[PDB]
Amino acid sequence: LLQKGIHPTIISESFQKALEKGIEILTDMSRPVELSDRETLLNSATTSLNSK
Amino acid sequence: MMPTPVILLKEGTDSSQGIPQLVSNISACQVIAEAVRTTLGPRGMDKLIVDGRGKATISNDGATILKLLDVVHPAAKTLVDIAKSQDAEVGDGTTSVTLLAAEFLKQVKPYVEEGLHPQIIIRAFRTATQLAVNKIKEIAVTVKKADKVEQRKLLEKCAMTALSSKLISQQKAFFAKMVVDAVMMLDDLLQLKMIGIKKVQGGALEDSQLVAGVAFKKTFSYAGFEMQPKKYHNPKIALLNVELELKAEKDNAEIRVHTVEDYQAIVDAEWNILYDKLEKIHHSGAKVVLSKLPIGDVATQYFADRDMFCAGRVPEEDLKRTMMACGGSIQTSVNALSADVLGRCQVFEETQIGGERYNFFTGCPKAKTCTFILRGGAEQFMEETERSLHDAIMIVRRAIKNDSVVAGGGAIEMELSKYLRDYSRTIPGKQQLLIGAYAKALEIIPRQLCDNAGFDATNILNKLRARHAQGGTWYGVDINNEDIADNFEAFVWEPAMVRINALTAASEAACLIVSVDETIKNPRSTVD
């Protein structure tokens, strides 16, 4: 982007805008979870431990 | 160990013996194979090696890489030696020999570690090698038709297969057609020195040309050379080995005169000798004069005045190629310049090729020689192009000797592995394990092709094994489709002698490495 001739302030503001849009997208992809749902907690723990 | 006041051998003598030293030898061979492992197949890569002086060599050829490595391990030097032997006898497959030898040693390493006698391993290797060579000779495909078109197609396919691993693989069809055209013009001995190879910087690979004649670079023209015409439409060529300039008649000659008239006569006699040689050359009818010895400025101006071309200090190989292309004879004396000793060509011309002048002899109908003019962007680019063309030329020469082919891409080796496994299933059992290990080691080349191409080698090897078990001799690795295919119908063809020599050399190297049980290194003398 810098080699193309863009100042590193338009890049920063554009990255901030993209981050806000991405936060919106990720929140849209979310799914409510209840702490009483043990299966979801077990799945999350297994996913965390899968790479170790 | 005890001090032993007077020692047996001199100090610094290192001795290694037993199973550990042979395991170390196998490991060193593995290292040497890994040094050239990645340069195999159409998806192979190149290695860059910098010498002490700072010059770098970039190559895909296994023999060149192994030679450039300063290998000092006594057991590891055998792989370099067999690579050189394969390059000398065949010219192609210098990577496969090292891969196969190291794979044999790696496969028999576990039996070495458990105390198996090396003689049993050597006998099993010899038996397996004999069986594999006989199988290759039996199943190799040959055509008993002597058809010119079919022979040309076979040579071109073999050349493309030999070329489809180098940086010139994109123009492999074009370069293979050039190579087959060049080799087919050699008469009966297929001498390599009859195929000149000139590398000129600049130009694309497709700009390289094959001259149906002889071409060589301009050789230090004198004054008055630019006054000579640079194109002739039916020149007679005088091939000479004569120094055409004013000089002492002999090194030991001495002239003694006591009269000014005799002094003038001697000067005029020297001039008359030179002019007599020049007039004898001119009266022969020749328009182009080439000499292995220097041609002076006086002779150059004399030829310019007669509208004739001269070129002195021509390299001997270029003169020999010119003689073979034109049909004359290199004359050390100009006293008998008959028409039988003068070369003929349809067109002679001096042209510009990338900031360098070259002399062209084209239109020769009876030429027995060629000249490649390779174009590239760098010195190592053209050097590697020359190496690839040399591989292709050697392959085409061997195929000219005999048109026996086997499908490449590991198909022949998978068939050999299946045959050897089937044979090993029907023997007592001490040799059965070793012959099975030999058959398994035969699978390294297709596995290495898959690894270099970035596939999953295990699944491809399983599919190849299943296909070979159920029938189909020529199923190998399809690099483009990431699968298996009938490599004979895909024209991945190799001369049978390539694999025969590869197996023979790899087996001999493995047997020699296994047969050694002790290594002794005497202390260095004259370290300076």
């Binding site: - | 550990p20 059992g429 690894d451 295990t458």
Partner: protein, 532 residues
């Protein structure tokens, strides 16, 4: 680009380096496996000499730099700590597992698949061992313990004298048997004091029916032998009394100084008078005793020993029924010693052992104790004797605690190899290869055993595998599971009948530890070595 002050190795380079380090560590000790193995003699930089056959001792004395090699050495140490035997076998198995796993990885098999296959193979091997290859010791009697001790002491300096040493070990272990809560018998090995003294041959080593002290009487005037000993064990010194840091003596009237100085020793005199008045004959203390108290004991005609080790004193006190006293203070604020605090023994003797003397407390009551005095040609041989004796004691303890044993001589390894090679075909596609490699790597033990004897390893291993395959396939040939290796004659042999036994815990723990170490090393594919 990284700009890290150090060296970085990534991928095949570091994997091969780790495998090379593990293989070197294995090859160091591979020559010391099985009854035909031979000892190694290690020399320190200061000239100290250690002659040993134990893998743990060799790997502890060695100075190691590579992290994977350190992992293997700590694996050997852990196997020694948790089992006591099979220290060489676990290292060899772990290195072979790592080598075969790396060979699989070089074939573009993902390391996670290899790890999963190794875990499955280890679990199935443990299950198969527990369900098929274990032998209950209830039907074998005392001969099972003797056979286990003989098998353990093979390859050791005391192997040929095993007929004697196995009886000694079994008696020593049985002498310290006790049952804790839940009614489970326990065998606290390391409670058998082992004393090493060069001198007479191995066959004249003594098993003491009591305890042996590496101590002598405080004064030459004391008797060297007491018949009916009343042992008093003290945890305090018997010296002239000195006030603490917080107490100071300041004299203003000179007439009090002599009384102060007299009481300064009269306190200890009174304490010793009480201790002797209770009727004690032998007094053992962890603290020192000065000349005055020694003379009190001499006049009393009693044996007094000073600077007794705390563990030795605890063992003696509990074997004889005495109570350790760190002070003569009761719950009434007074200074009393009671006869109920006295231990009893049938004899206490200071005997001479090779121009030196030690104290033997013979036949302690209310509890049986055991001590072993090893006689050898020199110090190094006695040290190797002690190491081998400890190995045998640990093996017997494991056999007595868990009453299952497995045949030795590589029978378990061959059976597991055959079973796992058969079983791999029913699990996955690449974990199949991992389980097959696990089974193949399990054969390194019989191969090394045969190699050490200069026998035909290939043919013997092939015969063993054929026997075990026949046992597993044929349903009425289940008696062939005990076919092991007879290294003396180089032939297969029914090791269950021959008496070559091992505790099941040795094999199970070795398998689990080797698998975990191999997985840990295989988990590495990149090394950053920061510059110091």
């Amino acid at each position: 680009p990284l700009s890290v002050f150090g060296d970085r190795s990534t991928g095949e380079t570091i994997r091969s380096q780790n495998v090379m380090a593990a293989a070197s560590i294995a090859n160091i000790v591979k020559s010391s496996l099985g009854p035909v193995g031979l000892d190694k003699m290690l020399v320190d930089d200061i000239g100290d000499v250690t002659i040993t056959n134990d893998g743990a001792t060799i790997l502890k004395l060695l100075e190691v730099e590579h992290p994977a090699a350190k992992v293997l050495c700590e694996l050997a140490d852990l196997q020694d700590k948790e089992v006591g035997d099979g220290t060489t076998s676990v290292v060899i198995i772990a290195a072979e597992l790592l080598k075969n796993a790396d060979e699989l990885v070089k074939q573009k098999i993902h390391p996670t698949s290899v790890i999963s296959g190794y875990r499955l193979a280890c679990k199935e091997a443990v299950r198969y061992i527990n369900e098929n290859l274990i032998v209950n010791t209830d039907e074998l009697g005392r001969d099972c313990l003797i056979n286990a001790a003989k098998t353990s002491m093979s390859s050791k300096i005391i192997g040929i004298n095993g007929d004697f040493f196995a009886n000694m070990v079994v008696d020593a272990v049985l002498a310290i048997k006790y049952t804790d809560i839940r009614g489970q018998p326990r065998y606290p090995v390391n409670s058998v004091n082992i004393l090493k003294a060069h001198g007479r041959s191995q066959m004249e080593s003594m098993l003491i029916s009591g305890y042996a002290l590496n101590c002598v009487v405080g004064s030459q005037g004391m008797p060297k032998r007491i018949v009916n000993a009343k042992i008093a064990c003290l945890d305090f010194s018997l010296q002239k009394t000195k006030m603490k840091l917080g107490v100071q003596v300041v004299i203003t009237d000179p007439e009090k100084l002599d009384q102060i100085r007299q009481r300064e020793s009269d306190i200890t005199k009174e304490r010793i008078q009480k201790i002797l008045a209770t009727g004690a004959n032998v007094i053992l203390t962890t603290g020192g005793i000065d000349d005055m108290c020694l003379k009190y004991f001499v006049e009393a005609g009693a044996m007094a020993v000073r600077r007794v080790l705390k563990r030795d004193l605890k063992r003696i006190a509990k074997a004889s029924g005495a109570t350790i006293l760190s002070t003569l203070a009761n719950l009434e604020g007074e200074e009393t010693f009671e006869a109920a605090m006295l231990g009893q023994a049938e004899e206490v003797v200071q005997e001479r052992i090779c121009d030196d003397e030690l104290i033997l407390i013979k036949n302690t009551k209310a509890r049986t104790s055991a001590s072993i005095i090893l006689r050898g040609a020199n110090d190094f041989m006695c040290d190797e004797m002690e190491r081998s004796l400890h190995d045998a004691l640990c093996v017997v303890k494991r056999v007595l605690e868990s009453k299952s044993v497995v045949p030795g001589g590589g029978a378990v390894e061959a059976a597991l190899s055959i079973y796992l090679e058969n079983y791999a075909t029913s699990m996955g596609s690449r974990e199949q290869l991992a389980i097959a490699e696990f089974a193949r790597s399990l054969l390194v033990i019989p191969n090394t055993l045969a190699v050490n004897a200069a026998q035909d390893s290939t043919d013997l291993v092939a015969k063993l595998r054929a026997f075990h395959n026949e046992a597993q396939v044929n349903p009425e040939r289940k008696n062939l599971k005990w076919i092991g290796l007879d290294l003396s004659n180089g032939k297969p042999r029914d090791n269950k009948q021959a008496g070559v036994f091992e505790p099941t815990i040795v094999k199970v723990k070795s398998l689990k530890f080797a698998t975990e170490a191999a997985i840990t090393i295989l988990r590495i594919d990149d090394l950053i070595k920061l510059h110091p």
